[PDB]
Design a protein around this motif. Structure first.
Motif, mmCIF file in Angstrom:
data_model
loop_
_atom_site.group_PDB
_atom_site.id
_atom_site.type_symbol
_atom_site.label_atom_id
_atom_site.label_comp_id
_atom_site.label_asym_id
_atom_site.label_seq_id
_atom_site.Cartn_x
_atom_site.Cartn_y
_atom_site.Cartn_z
ATOM 1 N N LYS A 1 -9.308 8.653 9.244
ATOM 2 C CA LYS A 1 -9.875 9.159 7.991
ATOM 3 C C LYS A 1 -11.053 8.311 7.569
ATOM 4 O O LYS A 1 -11.005 7.092 7.623
ATOM 5 N N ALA B 1 -9.328 9.471 -1.578
ATOM 6 C CA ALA B 1 -8.847 9.763 -0.237
ATOM 7 C C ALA B 1 -7.717 10.789 -0.247
ATOM 8 O O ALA B 1 -7.571 11.552 0.698
ATOM 9 N N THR C 1 -15.214 4.013 3.640
ATOM 10 C CA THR C 1 -14.043 3.546 4.337
ATOM 11 C C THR C 1 -13.967 4.348 5.613
ATOM 12 O O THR C 1 -13.983 5.540 5.553
ATOM 13 N N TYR D 1 -9.542 -8.114 4.079
ATOM 14 C CA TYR D 1 -10.483 -7.711 5.078
ATOM 15 C C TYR D 1 -11.367 -8.935 5.508
ATOM 16 O O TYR D 1 -11.738 -9.764 4.728
ATOM 17 N N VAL E 1 -9.008 -6.986 -1.670
ATOM 18 C CA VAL E 1 -8.973 -5.708 -2.397
ATOM 19 C C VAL E 1 -7.588 -5.564 -3.012
ATOM 20 O O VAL E 1 -6.588 -5.624 -2.302
ATOM 21 N N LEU F 1 -0.384 12.294 4.142
ATOM 22 C CA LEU F 1 -1.408 11.271 3.747
ATOM 23 C C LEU F 1 -0.799 9.821 3.807
ATOM 24 O O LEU F 1 -1.502 8.829 4.137
ATOM 25 N N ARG G 1 -4.929 -5.890 -0.089
ATOM 26 C CA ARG G 1 -5.507 -5.636 1.238
ATOM 27 C C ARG G 1 -6.606 -6.655 1.492
ATOM 28 O O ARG G 1 -7.480 -6.830 0.660
ATOM 29 N N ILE H 1 -8.789 -0.924 -9.348
ATOM 30 C CA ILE H 1 -9.030 -1.486 -8.021
ATOM 31 C C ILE H 1 -10.043 -2.588 -8.181
ATOM 32 O O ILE H 1 -11.125 -2.354 -8.748
ATOM 33 N N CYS I 1 -5.114 -3.336 -5.858
ATOM 34 C CA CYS I 1 -4.948 -2.036 -6.537
ATOM 35 C C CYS I 1 -3.731 -2.114 -7.414
ATOM 36 O O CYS I 1 -2.765 -2.780 -7.046
ATOM 37 N N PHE J 1 0.815 -1.200 0.000
ATOM 38 C CA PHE J 1 0.000 0.000 0.000
ATOM 39 C C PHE J 1 0.849 1.250 0.000
ATOM 40 O O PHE J 1 0.530 2.221 -0.721
HETATM 41 O O1 LIG Z 1 -8.417 1.803 2.225
HETATM 42 C C1 LIG Z 1 -8.657 2.679 1.409
HETATM 43 O O2 LIG Z 1 -9.892 2.957 0.966
HETATM 44 C C2 LIG Z 1 -7.701 3.621 0.863
HETATM 45 C C3 LIG Z 1 -7.295 3.512 -0.491
HETATM 46 N N1 LIG Z 1 -7.847 2.391 -1.187
HETATM 47 C C4 LIG Z 1 -7.463 1.092 -0.605
HETATM 48 C C5 LIG Z 1 -8.661 0.210 -0.962
HETATM 49 C C6 LIG Z 1 -8.830 0.098 -2.467
HETATM 50 C C7 LIG Z 1 -8.975 1.493 -3.092
HETATM 51 C C8 LIG Z 1 -7.866 2.455 -2.631
HETATM 52 N N2 LIG Z 1 -6.520 4.375 -1.120
HETATM 53 C C9 LIG Z 1 -6.025 5.394 -0.408
HETATM 54 C C10 LIG Z 1 -5.168 6.322 -1.079
HETATM 55 C C11 LIG Z 1 -4.631 7.363 -0.375
HETATM 56 C C12 LIG Z 1 -4.928 7.576 0.992
HETATM 57 CL CL1 LIG Z 1 -4.237 8.908 1.844
HETATM 58 C C13 LIG Z 1 -5.780 6.686 1.642
HETATM 59 C C14 LIG Z 1 -6.324 5.606 0.950
HETATM 60 C C15 LIG Z 1 -7.243 4.675 1.582
HETATM 61 C C16 LIG Z 1 -7.630 4.831 2.947
HETATM 62 C C17 LIG Z 1 -6.859 4.233 3.936
HETATM 63 C C18 LIG Z 1 -7.210 4.365 5.258
HETATM 64 C C19 LIG Z 1 -8.345 5.070 5.645
HETATM 65 C C20 LIG Z 1 -9.135 5.686 4.659
HETATM 66 C C21 LIG Z 1 -8.770 5.539 3.308
#
Ligand SMILES: O=C(O)c1c(N2CCCCC2)nc2ccc(Cl)cc2c1-c1ccccc1
Ligand SMILES: O=C(O)c1c(N2CCCCC2)nc2ccc(Cl)cc2c1-c1ccccc1
Length: 134
Positions: free
Chosen positions: A60, A77, A55, A130, A117, A31, A128, A106, A119, A18
């Motif tokens: 966050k 995000a 999320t 879950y 999940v 971030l 990732r 994704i 990416c 990640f």
């Molecule tokens: O988990 C995520 O949704 C996710 C994410 N995702 C990962 C899941 C698949 C899509 C991209 N992409 C990110 C890209 C940049 C930043 Cl700063 C945060 C995220 C988070 C994220 C992580 C922790 C808390 C809130 C959001």
């Protein structure tokens, strides 16, 4: 396999790649530190062709909604405004983001009762995992 099988609240239990994926996205350090350490829940809901993905974590929270198959503006995000499309295809939810001549995919799928999940941007990958929680 149906999109409805992905519904519910899911808790992050494992992440690989990640920080590398965020670095490919050019996410800045504030971030990236948040994302290395947040352990979010993902809440997926789907009413026919309407999908929402939220999320949530103390650090966050993010949320988007869309109609499957329709292009929409997603604020990510990290603050990108992408043209995104989500479809349920070949037993996975597939999300494609396009912005500024760049693209990322994704996927979200059910494997062995877990939400997996994945990416990618420019061959920089992340996975990732879950687990379904109440
Ligand atoms: O988990 C995520 O949704 C996710 C994410 N995702 C990962 C899941 C698949 C899509 C991209 N992409 C990110 C890209 C940049 C930043 Cl700063 C945060 C995220 C988070 C994220 C992580 C922790 C808390 C809130 C959001
Ligand atoms: O201590 C840090 O590494 C550090 C940090 N900086 C940036 C670079 C140098 C050192 C500290 N910047 C951050 C920015 C955003 C957030 Cl959410 C956390 C951090 C943490 C951090 C805090 C608590 C536990 C683990 C990491």
């Amino acid at each position: 396999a149906t999109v409805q099988q992905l519904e519910g609240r899911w808790r992050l239990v494992d992440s690989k790649g990640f920080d590398e994926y965020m670095k490919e996205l050019g996410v800045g350090i504030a971030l990236r530190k948040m994302g290395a350490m947040a352990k979010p829940d993902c809440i997926i809901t789907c009413d026919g062709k309407n999908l929402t993905i939220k999320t949530e974590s103390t650090l966050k929270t993010t949320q988007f909604s869309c109609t499957l198959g329709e292009k929409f503006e997603e604020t990510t995000a990290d603050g990108r405004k992408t043209q995104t499309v989500c479809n349920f295809t070949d037993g996975a939810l597939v999300q494609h983001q396009e912005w500024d001549g760049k693209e990322s995919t994704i996927t979200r799928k059910l494997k062995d009762g877990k939400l997996v999940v994945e990416c990618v941007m420019n061959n920089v990958t992340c996975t990732r995992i879950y687990e379904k929680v109440e």
